[PDB]
Amino acid sequence: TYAIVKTGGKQYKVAAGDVVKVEKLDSEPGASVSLPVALVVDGANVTSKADDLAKVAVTAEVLEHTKGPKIRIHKFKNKTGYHKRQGHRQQLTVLKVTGI
């Protein structure tokens, strides 16, 4: 069985024991959070109605807060002299799914 959970404006297909990177959540490592679900696929029957999906939630444990890959930005326009260097590292949390 597995479900499609929503967190941070995105959806992820997860099963029990899955480890998934996710946008930053305000929770300490070792805590537990509950997430809404967009679809549940248990065996054969598929849960898709809004109310049944509202009656269920996916519980996961925060593993750690990590950082994304370093991104180097160097904007440039020829025959202009314009340059603009910029870096970025996205913040992420690692969730391990405990059950559905």
Binding site: I4, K6, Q11, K13, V41, S48, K49, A50, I73, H74
Partner: protein
Amino acid sequence: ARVKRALNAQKKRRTVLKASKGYRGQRSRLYRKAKEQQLHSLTYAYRDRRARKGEFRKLWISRINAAARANDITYNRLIQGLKAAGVEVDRKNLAELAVSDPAAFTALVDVARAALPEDVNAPS
């Protein structure tokens, strides 16, 4: 105080040259050519990060269209029916279902067909 330029210049030269490993010909050896290629590379990467989301959405839509026509329904009618039925699975996980769990995709196609109007061309 007379100042020699070596250390300050070598810093950035090393940075640029290290970033240009793997390039072909002069673009990985000479600092000036490597710097030009680095300008182009970072511009390309910035543009392609924006375009990658659309590219992946196009691939997902292609796969969903294939799996939907395998169930005797077109992609556009299937999307309309899924929206009508209120299911909120995005195209990424829809393509994931189409490839990995064909039975689930068939079930979703059934609910989408149920949610569609009886005459799609009616002025409704």
